[PDB]
Amino acid sequence: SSRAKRIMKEIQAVKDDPAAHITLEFVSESDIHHLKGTFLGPPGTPYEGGKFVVDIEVPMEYPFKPPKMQFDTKVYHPNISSVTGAICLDILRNAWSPVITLKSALISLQALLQSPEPNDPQDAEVAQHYLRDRESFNKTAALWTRLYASETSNGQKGNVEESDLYGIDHDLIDEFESQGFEKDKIVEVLRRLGVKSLDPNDNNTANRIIEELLK
């Protein structure tokens, strides 16, 4: 479209050969109204290490066109994800420059994710909670992003794990096998249960498993 060309030009830069580590995929019919800019990055921090999908909404207005952004890996940060997915970066609550393109808003999130700013954020509950238990939220933060880094197809409520190569076969078997029980034992107890987050020497299900294992 005519007005769409405005945003298309911005995406052309990222489309110019795999470079800049940027991503821009619009999910809409001929009338591109909803934009979605993602960014791929390696690990090395609980705030970064996977994929991020920022739901962008680009209207058809030239004068003062503030690009909306929300959700984005539902990251739990004082800035991102306050109640139903919302960030605070220039063009969000009070922009001070109409030149701040969409690329700036996206790139700003990357540096923002790896930059704790609990001084004067938007979410007081998060800031106060992080101020006390920062180490407890740190680990939980990396886990959420590590699991919500990407998702195939649509969803009903929540589809986490149970998609890639399953590690529940000979690993859980090797434990009971060497113990003294035979494969036929583990299979019988594994098939019925079918746990995934099993512990070596700290699992309740295990005790119950071995219970039958001996019969």
UniProtKB/Swiss-Prot annotation:
One of its GO terms (cellular component) is nucleus. SMART domains: UBCc. Pathway: Protein modification; protein ubiquitination. GO terms for molecular function: ATP binding; proteasome binding; ubiquitin conjugating enzyme activity; ubiquitin-protein transferase activity. Residues 2-150 form the UBC core domain. Belongs to the ubiquitin-conjugating enzyme family. Induction: By heat shock and cadmium. One of its GO terms (biological process) is protein polyubiquitination. It catalyses: S-ubiquitinyl-[E1 ubiquitin-activating enzyme]-L-cysteine + [E2 ubiquitin-conjugating enzyme]-L-cysteine = [E1 ubiquitin-activating enzyme]-L-cysteine + S-ubiquitinyl-[E2 ubiquitin-conjugating enzyme]-L-cysteine. Pfam families: UBA_3, UQ_con. This is Ubiquitin-conjugating enzyme E2 1. Present with 8940 molecules/cell in log phase SD medium. The active site is at residue 88. There is a cross-link at residue 93 (Glycyl lysine isopeptide (Lys-Gly) (interchain with G-Cter in ubiquitin)). Keywords: ATP-binding, Isopeptide bond, Nucleotide-binding, Stress response, Transferase, Ubl conjugation, Ubl conjugation pathway. PANTHER family: UBIQUITIN-CONJUGATING ENZYME E2. It comes from the Eukaryota. Catalyzes the covalent attachment of ubiquitin to other proteins. Functions in degradation of misfolded or regulated proteins localized in the endoplasmic reticulum (ER) lumen or membrane via the ubiquitin-proteasome system. Cognate E2 conjugating enzyme for the HRD1 ubiquitin ligase complex, which is part of the ERAD-L and ERAD-M pathways responsible for the rapid degradation of soluble lumenal and membrane proteins with misfolded lumenal domains (ERAD-L), or ER-membrane proteins with misfolded transmembrane domains (ERAD-M). It is an enzyme of class 2 (transferase). Its EC number is 2.3.2.23.
